[PDB]
Amino acid sequence: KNIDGYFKIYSKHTPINLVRGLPQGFSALEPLVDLPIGINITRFQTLH
Amino acid sequence: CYFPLQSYGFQPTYGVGYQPYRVVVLSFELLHAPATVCGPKKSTNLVKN
């Protein structure tokens, strides 16, 4: 999430028995690190 | 036609006034970017009750 240029990174990692792609349940994410950068981002990619 | 760069003679025997001084110039500029660098803080004692 980008708030006034400050980047807020939220992360959650749990082991799961899910079949394909999604489980059924409720989980709340936790904060990880905040990045005071301020760059505008209009697009993104994934890395493999 | 002259070569612009000239050399500084450096020996301990030169006079004090002409001795080379290492100069560190700090440029202080306040832009519209969010402020980060600040002066040092001070922590005091903690009291309860």
Q: Which amino acid belongs to residue B12? A: P
* Residue A23 contacts B, CB cutoff 8 Å: no
Q: Which two tokens stand for residue A28?
A: 């709340």
Name the β-bridge partners of A31: A10
**Which residues fall within 8 angstroms of residue A38, CB to CB, at 6 or more apart?**
A5, A6, B33, B34
Experimental method: cryo-EM
The residues in B 25-44 lying below 8 A from A, measured between CB atoms, are 33-34, 36
Dist CA A36 CA A32 (whole Å): 14
* Residue A5 contacts B, CB cutoff 8 Å: yes
Q: Which amino acid belongs to residue B6? A: Q
**Cited resolution, angstroms:** 3.6
